[PDB]
Amino acid sequence: MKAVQYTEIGSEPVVVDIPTPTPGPGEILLKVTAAGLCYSDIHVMDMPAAQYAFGLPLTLGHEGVGTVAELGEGVTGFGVGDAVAVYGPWGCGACHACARGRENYCTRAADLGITPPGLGSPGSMAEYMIVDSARHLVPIGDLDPVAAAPLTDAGLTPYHAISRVLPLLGPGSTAVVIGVGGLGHVGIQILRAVSAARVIAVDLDDDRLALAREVGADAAVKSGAGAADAIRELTGGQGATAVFDFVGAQSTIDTAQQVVAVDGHISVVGIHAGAHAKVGFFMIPFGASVVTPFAGTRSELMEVVALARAGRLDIHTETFTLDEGPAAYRRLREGSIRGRGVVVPT
Amino acid sequence: MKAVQYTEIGSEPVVVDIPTPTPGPGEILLKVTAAGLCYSDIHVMDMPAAQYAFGLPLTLGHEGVGTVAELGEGVTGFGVGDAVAVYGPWGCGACHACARGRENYCTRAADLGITPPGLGSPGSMAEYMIVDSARHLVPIGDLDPVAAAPLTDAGLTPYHAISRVLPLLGPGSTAVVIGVGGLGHVGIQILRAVSAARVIAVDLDDDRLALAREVGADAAVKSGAGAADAIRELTGGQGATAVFDFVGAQSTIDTAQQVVAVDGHISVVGIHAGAHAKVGFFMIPFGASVVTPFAGTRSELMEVVALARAGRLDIHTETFTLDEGPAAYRRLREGSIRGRGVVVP
Amino acid sequence: MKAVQYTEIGSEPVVVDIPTPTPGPGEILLKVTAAGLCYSDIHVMDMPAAQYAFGLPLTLGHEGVGTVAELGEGVTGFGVGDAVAVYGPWGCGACHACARGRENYCTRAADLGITPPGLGSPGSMAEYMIVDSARHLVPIGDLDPVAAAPLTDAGLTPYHAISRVLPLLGPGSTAVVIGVGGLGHVGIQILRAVSAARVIAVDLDDDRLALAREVGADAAVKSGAGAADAIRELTGGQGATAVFDFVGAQSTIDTAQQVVAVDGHISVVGIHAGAHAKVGFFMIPFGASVVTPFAGTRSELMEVVALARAGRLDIHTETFTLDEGPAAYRRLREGSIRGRGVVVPT
Amino acid sequence: MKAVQYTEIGSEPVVVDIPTPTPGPGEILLKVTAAGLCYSDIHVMDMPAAQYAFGLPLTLGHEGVGTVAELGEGVTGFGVGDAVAVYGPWGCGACHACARGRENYCTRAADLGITPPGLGSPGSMAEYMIVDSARHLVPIGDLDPVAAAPLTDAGLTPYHAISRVLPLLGPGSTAVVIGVGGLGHVGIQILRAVSAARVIAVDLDDDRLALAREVGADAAVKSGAGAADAIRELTGGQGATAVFDFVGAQSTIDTAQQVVAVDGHISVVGIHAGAHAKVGFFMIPFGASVVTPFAGTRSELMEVVALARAGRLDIHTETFTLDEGPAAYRRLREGSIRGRGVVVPT
Ligand SMILES: NC(=O)c1ccc[n+]([C@@H]2O[C@H](COP(=O)([O-])OP(=O)(O)OC[C@H]3O[C@@H](n4cnc5c(N)ncnc54)[C@H](O)[C@@H]3O)[C@@H](O)[C@H]2O)c1
Ligand SMILES: NC(=O)c1ccc[n+]([C@@H]2O[C@H](COP(=O)([O-])OP(=O)(O)OC[C@H]3O[C@@H](n4cnc5c(N)ncnc54)[C@H](O)[C@@H]3O)[C@@H](O)[C@H]2O)c1
Ligand SMILES: NC(=O)c1ccc[n+]([C@@H]2O[C@H](COP(=O)([O-])OP(=O)(O)OC[C@H]3O[C@@H](n4cnc5c(N)ncnc54)[C@H](O)[C@@H]3O)[C@@H](O)[C@H]2O)c1
Ligand SMILES: NC(=O)c1ccc[n+]([C@@H]2O[C@H](COP(=O)([O-])OP(=O)(O)OC[C@H]3O[C@@H](n4cnc5c(N)ncnc54)[C@H](O)[C@@H]3O)[C@@H](O)[C@H]2O)c1
Ligand SMILES: C[C@@H](CCC(=O)O)C(=O)O
Ligand SMILES: C[C@@H](CCC(=O)O)C(=O)O
Ligand SMILES: C[C@@H](CCC(=O)O)C(=O)O
Ligand SMILES: C[C@@H](CCC(=O)O)C(=O)O
Ligand SMILES: [Zn+2]
Ligand SMILES: [Zn+2]
Ligand SMILES: [Zn+2]
Ligand SMILES: [Zn+2]
Ligand SMILES: [Zn+2]
Numbered sequence A, C, D: 001m002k003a004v005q006y007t008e009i010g011s012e013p014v015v016v017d018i019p020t021p022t023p024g025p026g027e028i029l030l031k032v033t034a035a036g037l038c039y040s041d042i043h044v045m046d047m048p049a050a051q052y053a054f055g056l057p058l059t060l061g062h063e064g065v066g067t068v069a070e071l072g073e074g075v076t077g078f079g080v081g082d083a084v085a086v087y088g089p090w091g092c093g094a095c096h097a098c099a100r101g102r103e104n105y106c107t108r109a110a111d112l113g114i115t116p117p118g119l120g121s122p123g124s125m126a127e128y129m130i131v132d133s134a135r136h137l138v139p140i141g142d143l144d145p146v147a148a149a150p151l152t153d154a155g156l157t158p159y160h161a162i163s164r165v166l167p168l169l170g171p172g173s174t175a176v177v178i179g180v181g182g183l184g185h186v187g188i189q190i191l192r193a194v195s196a197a198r199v200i201a202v203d204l205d206d207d208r209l210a211l212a213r214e215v216g217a218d219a220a221v222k223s224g225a226g227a228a229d230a231i232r233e234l235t236g237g238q239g240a241t242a243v244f245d246f247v248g249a250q251s252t253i254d255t256a257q258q259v260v261a262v263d264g265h266i267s268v269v270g271i272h273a274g275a276h277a278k279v280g281f282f283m284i285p286f287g288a289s290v291v292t293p294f295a296g297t298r299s300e301l302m303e304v305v306a307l308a309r310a311g312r313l314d315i316h317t318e319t320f321t322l323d324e325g326p327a328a329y330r331r332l333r334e335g336s337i338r339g340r341g342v343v344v345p346t
Numbered sequence B: 001m002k003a004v005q006y007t008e009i010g011s012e013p014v015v016v017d018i019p020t021p022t023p024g025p026g027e028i029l030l031k032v033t034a035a036g037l038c039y040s041d042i043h044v045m046d047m048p049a050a051q052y053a054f055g056l057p058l059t060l061g062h063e064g065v066g067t068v069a070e071l072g073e074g075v076t077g078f079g080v081g082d083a084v085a086v087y088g089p090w091g092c093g094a095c096h097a098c099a100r101g102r103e104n105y106c107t108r109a110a111d112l113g114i115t116p117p118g119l120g121s122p123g124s125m126a127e128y129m130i131v132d133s134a135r136h137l138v139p140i141g142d143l144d145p146v147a148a149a150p151l152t153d154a155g156l157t158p159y160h161a162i163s164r165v166l167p168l169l170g171p172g173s174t175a176v177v178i179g180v181g182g183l184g185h186v187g188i189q190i191l192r193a194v195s196a197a198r199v200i201a202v203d204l205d206d207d208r209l210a211l212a213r214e215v216g217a218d219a220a221v222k223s224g225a226g227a228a229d230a231i232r233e234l235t236g237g238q239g240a241t242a243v244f245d246f247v248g249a250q251s252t253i254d255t256a257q258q259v260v261a262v263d264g265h266i267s268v269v270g271i272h273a274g275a276h277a278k279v280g281f282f283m284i285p286f287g288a289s290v291v292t293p294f295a296g297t298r299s300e301l302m303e304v305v306a307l308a309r310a311g312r313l314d315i316h317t318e319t320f321t322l323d324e325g326p327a328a329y330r331r332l333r334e335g336s337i338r339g340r341g342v343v344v345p
């Protein structure tokens, strides 16, 4: 089968021919119908040799949707042909976090050698992929696979981040979304669907601010030195109830701290090495909590899929073939994908 | 009346004779029965002239309990003689936070000129004190005033900090308490009363570790460079579900970040200027939230009082006269009060 | 001043001339700009002499909006001319419930002689009204008073009922609204604004089903013996996550029990004497909680006002003069007000 | 192997000799170390032929602890000899409830033919028992099996019931526990461990009231006509914040409604056919919710085990052999087991 793999440290990923895998006991083989590109793949491929720990080669893609092609021995709960999304952040399934579906916060996974697809195990950027267990598949019914693939991370991650503080986001609240890319453009829509928050989007790029308004942002602010003051002018001086920072650069985190309300929240979702919030007296408002959330829970993925099925999420995508996978990663690097890149095999 | 006031920047507070105040409309005059000393008073008196904004003179004391002495015009809901605790962090009463009793997070109070007693308005370190409104009094019934005065901040603040994340602190959880002083020794007891968390106390001083064990800590370990490893050995490598840092120095915040569990919590309660948690990827576990909480809510003060009345809080105090107030502040500075200092007028 | 009062047990309310009140210390005099009619007023006026406890005469109206006309001695926080809504369910202000703004659940109010306007104290169906304390006023800014008056009960009560179980109403959930009148037509809109629940409206009257669809219900079905089966067909056999019953008749409560999901919720909001849910094993699904909520909290009223100001609530009203107040009550009795009746004094 | 089975409708269970089962793929064979008797087994054996649906014969016992004896094909995560408690209310593992560990509220289990051990599948009152999946085992380490077996239902069920409303049970709250048997005597202890609620225990039997005080009840009240007044005298007239009714007879539910506070909670946990709360205006306080909870969640079982391991639960038991199993059921019927009956296979 055809796959896109990271094969050499510091090199672009390549299209390869590798064996179609066979599912062992408990496993499911999917025919991949769509595989999302996430900017985290760029972080992974930019790691120096000393830090990179996912093994080579690595079939990329941790945003996967497919149809069940083959059931491993003992698997029930799915039939051949069933359309499914892959729950990405695999946990041990047994610990207290996993018992609540919070496999994203499993502390046993590392020691047990459990790695996610596209991030230590073979990913979805291939004609076929293996899933370890039935509990990591969520049915999507007749959802368009191209728009469904991003739900598994571009949807799941903002959904989880928002869910952690949803009780704060009542009528009269304001939520700031910083970074209107793959995650952020879905984040805006989740906020509109599950809360009555007023949504202010922030981006460097005017076309991304246009995208923000297209997907339901109430206001759009240019990122940079003026952003904090502009956001404060929009919130009447009180600041924003919650800031969801999908960039996570020091400058955006600083913006977030300068605008968050007393008893509000900053969610640092975007990853920029070294960047951090400074949470201490006189540096942040009283009661304003800060967290770096990770991925999301099993039930949260189901909820994201339910939003999509109800017509609440307009996922902006551009489609690529497997052959175009490396080109798509170059596009993601340069910031020229308006929303989420999605590879559609064959 | 006799009062203890901060009167000159950089100087020790002094015992003064000033007029007994008279309550205006809506106000209540209390005869103070106990006034707690909080280390925040030390922070206030150490502010340089450029930062200090509470006015001079300032009658100290933001931990106050008393008996109703005089009702201002229009006040009902209290009779003369009623024993009451003063809710300290006065808000506007009208905004969305205040409407939920969360006057500690009122953003309108500053612009309206509303300041708390002992921190801009006259405090409880005096024979009498004024309270602005009935909603800032909580009845304490027959609670011993000496043990009650600390409830208003030493109790309230940890109670609020713990309450923010109480749903995390189920059976099998671990809570670390750093700093077993006024706040911390009450924090341990609140954790034991309202959760099934295992409680690990941390302090510099071995006598404070003994205090921690006396008030129900499951383990008590020495603060400093070895504390993170010692705490991890106790938690089996998984770390602590929540860390309540009542010191808030950079070294204790660093300890907190090195021990907090995935999806846990750090509450930076103690105040040390410039100190901060560094909340970013690779610097803290996934899902571990960090906050600097402030004071507590109206209903939280009532709950603290209810814990005290039920016998769940053994408040360790040392009692001082008004005349000894300045000496008590010196004792607080040097760290020689085992628990909370309380002035009794 | 002109007022509408209940003056004789069993008789229609009457238009009267009574003294314009003067505010004592702590009180505020409002010039009433709009006064809502609630079906609870019908329940009150239908009480026999032995049950009726609100005193005669009683100026009706517990849904009040006005402008501050006179400040009593010592009142600050409001200026003359400020547009305000009256928080209805007055409590003691001092107990643990009141300290959280939950004056609706105050247990001390009765013993202290504290009664709400229109329900023991003089109401808003008059040119002027007294409010006991500043904490019972919420600013409405430039909101149209006619559409604002219903927020104080038609908005507040459903808002509170929904808020009690808002965490259940995630994506994929279904909420049933029974009774699309004053409360119900606002309840539908609150559900759409603060949740991603699919909303199924139920009413006896086809025109009310049309109203339900106009204000955003996803489906609207006829009440009665077939309603439970029709709702189950819409929910795929799993039943409804939550049922908000704004009728509260035995037949509607029975419908609610026959459709509620496992681990769901029934909120019995409507008042029909003797009617009750039967909460016991084999009579209701496992984990399905049932409550009779009452009014709402101070912060909830502020949130309702915030929804209205954000354009999320289209309040359907019909306007009456004070002189038409008794006629409006006859209209409410016969069920011919499409939404909420509102008296506008002048 | 020896087992205790219900074999004939209306007859006492019998000691039988049946084949030792062998684990199929995914299954685990446990050597049973302790098997709890629950009064629900009495309800099951009293069902007429027309209602009884669990098949005959049925190996009783849905409170099971054991050691891993044999691993089925594919099972890892447990080693032979590991001490484990069985999570009883088996669900499908895949639905939204199950994804959160809430298999107790699974709606798919019935249609998939999934039944719990002792309640449709073979139970723990045998020398060995099969568990369907690793996710239904929770490690107990060196916990005494006799005191551990009741945790799986006598602990789990009250724990779940309490957990549903734990935020109500702050300092100053009162919780009433009605019925100080298997469940109730553990319920008291959970309340003391996880809340600062004052606990009032209610029972018919003075020896059970003594047991209540032994396990930490603050007060003990004789059940019956005087109980409501006695409880109100203890709560100062305000009533009880929460009532956990482990009897669920009409008289105890009536007591519960007569004592529950405004904005409180009644949890009807005990099963008495036909008995129900009457939740309607004028029949219950405003805001007082009522539910019939069922079993508990996966993570709740882990928490119960954690309480036991921390020394917070003193489980009162009487031990029986397998041969004495039928005698133990007679003892349970007559109400002569002080706490929980536990069979220990030889
Ligand atoms: N925490 C998690 O679990 C998690 C999960 C997935 C992705 N991520 C991270 O989230 C981030 C976003 O991922 P993506 O795939 O959406 O990226 P993307 O490249 O699709 O989007 C980036 C967006 O941010 C904007 N942007 C860049 N710098 C900005 C600034 N200084 N101010 C405002 N806007 C700015 C860009 O214009 C673009 O709209 C990445 O760092 C990724 O690794 C985190
Ligand atoms: N956030 C708020 O709303 C709020 C409210 C009140 C007080 N505070 C702050 O809480 C802090 C504690 O106040 P207090 O009155 O309890 O102080 P205290 O002087 O009574 O107690 C300090 C305790 O901390 C211990 N300690 C000091 N340095 C330590 C270290 N590095 N590691 C471990 N233990 C250490 C001491 O040995 C002592 O037991 C102060 O900074 C105070 O200003 C905050
Ligand atoms: N719990 C509380 O705090 C609270 C507060 C306010 C009002 N209420 C009560 O809520 C109820 C609704 O009040 P309102 O002012 O909205 O009434 P309304 O008369 O404006 O609306 C009643 C609606 O219910 C519909 N209806 C009547 N019987 C029905 C049935 N069997 N099935 C379906 N629909 C039916 C009518 O067609 C109408 O659309 C009243 O009983 C009132 O007393 C309760
Ligand atoms: N909801 C669930 O998921 C669930 C789970 C397990 C058990 N149960 C049910 O819980 C109930 C209790 O089970 P158990 O095994 O603890 O029973 P048990 O026989 O061990 O205890 C019954 C206790 O209730 C007391 N009692 C009986 N009638 C009473 C009355 N009128 N007032 C006060 N006390 C009274 C008895 O004296 C005894 O102390 C049973 O009905 C059982 O079926 C429910
Ligand atoms: C490398 C990065 C992957 C997150 C993601 O799934 O996008 C992470 O593990 O934090
Ligand atoms: C000066 C200090 C006071 C805190 C306290 O009330 O103890 C603060 O405002 O943070
Ligand atoms: C009299 C009635 C008033 C309800 C309402 O405010 O509509 C009640 O209190 O039940
Ligand atoms: C028969 C009974 C079993 C409850 C239990 O597990 O004890 C029920 O299904 O409710
Ligand atoms: Zn990603
Ligand atoms: Zn795990
Ligand atoms: Zn202080
Ligand atoms: Zn305020
Ligand atoms: Zn009404």
Ligand SMILES: [Zn+2]
Residues within 6 Å of the ligand: C091, C092, C093, C094, C095, C096, C097, C098, C103, C106, C107, C108, C109
């Ligand atoms: Zn009250």
Ligand SMILES: [Zn+2]
Residues within 6 Å of the ligand: D038, D039, D040, D041, D062, D153
């Ligand atoms: Zn049972």
Ligand SMILES: [Zn+2]
Residues within 6 Å of the ligand: D091, D092, D093, D094, D095, D096, D097, D098, D103, D106, D107, D108, D109
């Ligand atoms: Zn299920």
